[PDB]
Amino acid sequence: RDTLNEAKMWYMQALGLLGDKPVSIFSNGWENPSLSNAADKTQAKQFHD
Amino acid sequence: EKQADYIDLIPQGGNQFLVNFSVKKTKKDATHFSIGYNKSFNNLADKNGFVPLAGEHYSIPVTLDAKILEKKTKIGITRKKPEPASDENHYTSATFTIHPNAEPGIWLLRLNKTLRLAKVSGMTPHETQHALIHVRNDSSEYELRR
Numbered sequence: 001r002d003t004l005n006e007a008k009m010w011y012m013q014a015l016g017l018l019g020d021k022p023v024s025i026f027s028n029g030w031e032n033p034s035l036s037n038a039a040d041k042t043q044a045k046q047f048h049d
Numbered sequence: 050e051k052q053a054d055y056i057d058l059i060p061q062g063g064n065q066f067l068v069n070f071s072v073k074k075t076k077k078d079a080t081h082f083s084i085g086y087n088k089s090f091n092n093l094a095d096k097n098g099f100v101p102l103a104g105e106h107y108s109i110p111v112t113l114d115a116k117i118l119e120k121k122t123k124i125g126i127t128r129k130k131p132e133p134a135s136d137e138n139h140y141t142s143a144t145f146t147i148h149p150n151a152e153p154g155i156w157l158l159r160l161n162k163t164l165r166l167a168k169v170s171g172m173t174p175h176e177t178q179h180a181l182i183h184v185r186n187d188s189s190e191y192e193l194r195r
């Protein structure tokens with residue numbers, strides 16, 4: 001029993017290191033693009049520019 | 050005016066929309082029907098080889114901008130009279146207006162109902178709203194009963 005409370009305090013310390021679980025967004029500015037539109041050469045040129 | 054249909058915009062997301070409609074009187078004439086926009090321009094979707102039917106829900110996508118939607122944009126639908134048709138049929142329309150960050154409350158009571166009911170029923174909050182039936186005159190007593 002006491003070693004299970006030990007287990008709980010270790011995992012709670014690990015959760016204290018990690019913190020708040022990041023909520024993954026799904027409602028997003030991601031439109032659904034065309035594969036022709038997604039792979040434009042200008043789309044990487046402007047990015048690295 | 051007397052009765053044509055209800056027409057509903059349903060925003061899929063950024064620059065992606067959808068039109069649900071259910072036309073009442075479907076007897077006369079339709080060959081590859083049209084959808085108007087700003088009352089005078091933009092045949093939005095002429096791709097149907099189908100004539101809509103009486104009292105039946107439909108769905109057809111269209112991609113627009115929210116910038117014109119910020120103004121009043123008069124979206125019509127045009128059951129196409131066979132050789133000539135621009136607006137000469139039994140025509141109807143609607144305008145549509147968006148303006149952000151306004152009246153937060155009236156949506157949130159529905160979220161309250163489905164979240165209490167989802168925690169209670171043990172079902173996930175998606176599947177509880179997925180298992181609720183909504184009609185415009187459906188009382189929430191009858192929805193609870195169902």
